[PDB]
């Protein structure tokens, strides 16, 4: 019985990267050719394991993490990367054993005048550890002066909205991302 990936892949709504979605699935089969040839994928890399032996593998559960980021932020979804996404939103460990799938979804996730739904984290005191999630909304203090919840100079709201206009360059257009973690 192959795994039920359409529930996370074909889901009509995706989550922001800062409140990224985690779905576990148990006791099933993951074939590489069966899902590579599933659709139009702009990013499909597998670390740790080998794609060809994906269904020669045994594991307890599979966590299918999923979120929406923008095109030139997909390269951050990798081990040992850095930047706003991989430091404040979704860190992958250095020993990651699994896969990263991405694809363009301007047509789904962009609205004329903007799709102000998908958010991302812009600041944080410290670097997320692998698979840590944070949806706190505290005023990020950037200087010595305390913020006190009141926004202003060196006192920023930690979250911003993507533009996600269908007019933007593919560079800064919505991308659907699913991360398959095997443990």
């Amino acid at each position, epitope marked *: 019985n192959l795994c039920p990936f359409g529930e996370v892949f074909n889901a009509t709504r995706f989550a922001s990267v800062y409140a990224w979605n985690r779905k576990r699935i148990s006791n099933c089969v993951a074939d590489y050719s069966v899902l590579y040839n599933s659709a139009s994928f702009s990013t499909f890399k597998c670390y740790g394991v080998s794609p060809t032996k994906l269904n020669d593998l045994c594991f307890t559960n599979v966590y299918a993490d999923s979120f929406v980021i923008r095109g030139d932020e997909v390269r951050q979804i990798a081990p040992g990367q850095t930047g706003k996404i991989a430091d404040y939103n979704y860190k992958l460990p250095d020993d990651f054993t699994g896969c990263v799938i991405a694809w363009n979804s301007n047509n789904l996730d962009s609205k004329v005048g903007g799709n102000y739904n998908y958010l991302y984290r812009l600041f944080r005191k410290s670097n997320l550890k692998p698979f840590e999630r944070d949806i706190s909304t505290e005023i990020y203090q*950037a*200087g*010595s*002066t*305390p913020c006190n919840g009141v926004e*202003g*100079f*060196n006192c*920023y709201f930690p979250l911003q909205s993507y533009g996600f206009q269908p007019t933007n360059g593919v560079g800064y257009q919505p991308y659907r991302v699913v991360v398959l973690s095997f443990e």
Partner: single-chain antibody
Amino acid sequence: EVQLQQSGPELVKPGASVKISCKTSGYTFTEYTMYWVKQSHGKSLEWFGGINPNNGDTSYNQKFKGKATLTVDKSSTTAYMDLRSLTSEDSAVYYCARDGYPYYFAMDYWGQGTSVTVSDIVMTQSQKFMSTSVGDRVSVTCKASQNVDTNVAWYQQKPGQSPKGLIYSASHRYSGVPDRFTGSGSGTDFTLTISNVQSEDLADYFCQQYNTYPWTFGGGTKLEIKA
């Protein structure tokens, strides 16, 4: 190897304008907020305003509202100030200074200064002059108008020289500051004790609050030595 290098002295005739610069190096430019501090008649320190190099965010002290514009150039890791319809007031010494957060609070690195010629909280420093001898203990007071709980710093101005941070966060010593400088205070009244006064401690000592903007200074306390 932190270095804040400002532009040279500017002599400009009244009503004109001039753009001084602060070329930084030795650290990652975009990671630390930058401030400008004005030192003029009365020989006292006036916070001028800040700029965040990462987003170009600004905050202006409203005394000088419209007197200057703060910009940065990430291409050359440089902070600029652009002055505006100068009077005789504007003749002063302007320092650029780096916010230390999160490692050291307040202004942990200053520049050499540029001599240009042509509900606020009030830090009050009782004595404008003290005299001890070497090896004596001396203390210096500041009274803040409001509550500023431990968000106070102490600076050292040796003659002809930029201020150097001594105490930050009311009681913590900056990197390289001798043990005979201890800070004490909380809430509104703060003291700076120099315990074993050395020859080289002759200087002006300024307090500063950084609880809210604008940042504000005491008037200073000349400290003079004899032996």
